[PDB]
alpha-n-acetylglucosaminidase
Amino acid sequence: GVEITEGVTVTAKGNTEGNTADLAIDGDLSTYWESSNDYKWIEVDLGGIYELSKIEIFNKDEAVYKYNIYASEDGENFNKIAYKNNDNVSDSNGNMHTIDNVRAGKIRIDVVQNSNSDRVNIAEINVFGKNTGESLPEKKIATSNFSETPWATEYEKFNSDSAYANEKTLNEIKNLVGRVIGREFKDKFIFEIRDQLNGNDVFEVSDSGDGKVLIKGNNGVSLASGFNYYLKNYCNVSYNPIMGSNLKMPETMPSVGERVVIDTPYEHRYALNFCTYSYTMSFWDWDQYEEFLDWCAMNGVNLVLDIIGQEEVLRRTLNEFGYSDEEVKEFISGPAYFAWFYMQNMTGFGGPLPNDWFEQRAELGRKMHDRMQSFGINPVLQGYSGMVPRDFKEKNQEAQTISQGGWCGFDRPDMLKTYVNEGEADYFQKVADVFYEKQKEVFGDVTNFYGVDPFHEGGNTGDLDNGKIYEIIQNKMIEHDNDAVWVIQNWQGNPSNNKLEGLTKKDQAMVLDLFSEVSPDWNRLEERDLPWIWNMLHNFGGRMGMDAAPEKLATEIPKALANSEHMVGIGITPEAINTNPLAYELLFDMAWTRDQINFRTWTEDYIERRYGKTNKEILEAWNIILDTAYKKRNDYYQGAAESIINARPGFGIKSASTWGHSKIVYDKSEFEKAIEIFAKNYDEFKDSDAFLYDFADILKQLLANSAQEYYEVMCNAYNNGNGEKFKFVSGKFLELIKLQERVLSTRPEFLIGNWIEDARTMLKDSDDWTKDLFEFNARALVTTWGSRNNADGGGLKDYSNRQWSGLTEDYYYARWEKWINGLQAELDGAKAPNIDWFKMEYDWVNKKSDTDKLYPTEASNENLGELAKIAMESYSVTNMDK
Ligand SMILES: CC(=O)N[C@H]1/C(=N/OC(=O)Nc2ccccc2)O[C@H](CO)[C@@H](O)[C@@H]1O
Ligand SMILES: [Ca+2]
């Protein structure tokens, strides 16, 4: 050994009674620790630093277990030293793991799998090593106050000094040019501040007289919109840092000709759903955020949801009410779940966050507010409605809370009673006062716009009056910022008129009609004289598929402007920004007109600048897309139609996610014609990346569509009990998925490995524990979402399903192959079992890039034209009989 038989202790973050953590180290094989929740790990302190040579683990039974062992010599960093990932059963002899004489004062054992239960266990753990004579070192989470930073000095300088602020802005608009099209095009522009045009945001583009482009605008985003206007209408250039670009500039800067002056009737152009921060932006670095804000300003956006670094604000707030930093970390979710954590739906899951997290994200948020200030983009910060942890009373006995029940199998945080009786302590007032103060401490006065949404998708209003709740929440927000505007989401008829009528100051609230392009609900808001924004939702969960509503955008936005007195803006509220760039380009365009436009000729113009060129055939393919996947519909529907490939296998499947659809409302063979045309023009257009993007989009749409048809043939073949029929069609079905995987390999944005690597690398000098945990977050979100009770009982299984390379191969295909094998076995042998899908899915979720399989961050050289012809030939609906 030698075995460390003394001074060793252990902690855990949950257990089923009375299977406490100490039962893992009590020398007794008949006693065990057992997990109760999603913290499936224990932490052994060794009473000093040892050089470990061996670690021995015993489980309570003969099930197959999988786990990862991490160690620390500094008490801060936990690095992986051992793991079990083989399918061998536990037995009476235990598992012995050799350690490379690694210095360790603490150990973590994360038992990520148990073949017999959702719940995990360690009966005993023995650690063998050589005592170093040393002891683990002492360090507390500490963050800077905004006012004490270079950010505050800069922020105030912009605020007080007009000439400085203008210089800063103009220089930023110029840096934007250098980032977007290249440094060599920067001095080809002259940027000027002008006034508003009758109280409206405005830009101008004209010729300087010496071959440069002169652009005027009342602020940053107006300038960047003039820049984009020039690129789009004169340079035939189209920028989308997420969904494909044409950035090929002419040899000479083209002349503007006659001067243009373009204003917008809208006070706000809005961007972001709480969900975007999770489904898309979870693992974004500053570079990705910088890109995004350039694209924002260029698209006219001046109002943007901002929850970056809100974990520090909450930490400082909770610290005042009896919570340690560790307890705060247990409250807050992991980095993929902030959407539903800030919307009061869930706690804990994916966590705990590393100690490093707090400072890094406060800094990222300060960085973002600096650029936003330069552009004149208002962030929407956080308001406070009463959200507290479920043990808030234990720590603050006089506090009055309301249990909020569950959300999709998760426990919702409590909610402080917004008001109490006389003679009762008012903890809404105490905690709200701290919250707004700590939010100032972390970021300063950066905005008058605050977002909070009590009772989002459920909860419980207890004994309280609905209107009185919304009266007090607003009054309190205005208390700490007299100019405050409470940004309120409008989702599925909530908040009701009765909550909304509680708003005593209508000017200081702004309601986001979240789903205005499928299900508008602004009439109720307009009738109550409430300022409101018209929003395109479009995207649910980052689910992919050809789908957009260009005609409604072209018509309904200007029509709403004319039919109303309280529409203060338009915007986007997608759950992910990863799909259908047409929709988002058209919506932000609709801000700069009071008249309806022609969606058909708009598209004709759009595709030319996107591909860099156009022709008769490419146009007619896009008309086919407009006539099919993009055709105006009048039904209710959430998201693009879902692919059967991404569905949990079975009979009578009508979607992949619980409240989704797989119904194709257009003619499939008609849509396939677009792919024929794209393939026919491939060689001419392959120099365009945005063309390849769209080709991959419609081609993977073609194969999703045909897969559905093939699935029904093979289902009919089994239900008719033969047989070698089934083998054939089931085999052609799996072959189709293998072709799909090749299609998806062509796009960097469709690679699972990019999502995952971004998770593992988003902070620097992270230990293996943090990287592994963040990869858990990335895997789980796009698949099971949560654990068994969240995936199954909760309805969240495959909610965020992705048509992604690697994921399709190792997860979607694998599910379908097992089920086929399957039915075949029976049809020949009998009979086919019930497959416990979650088990199989969570197997993949818990795999790690460094020990299991590293997914590529690099696209393939596969030929889409060629791939398209293979699709038309063998895997199409058009040729489906042959
Ligand atoms: C799981 C998830 O992300 N659900 C989101 C969500 N789900 O909406 C649905 O697709 N449908 C659905 C919503 C409520 C009840 C049943 C289905 O939309 C809301 C607004 O975009 C978000 O606030 C919810 O977080
Ligand atoms: Ca024991």
Notes: The CA atoms of residues 780 and 786 lie 6 Å apart. The two ends are 70 Å apart (CA to CA). The domain at 265-595 is CATH 3.20.20.80 (TIM Barrel).
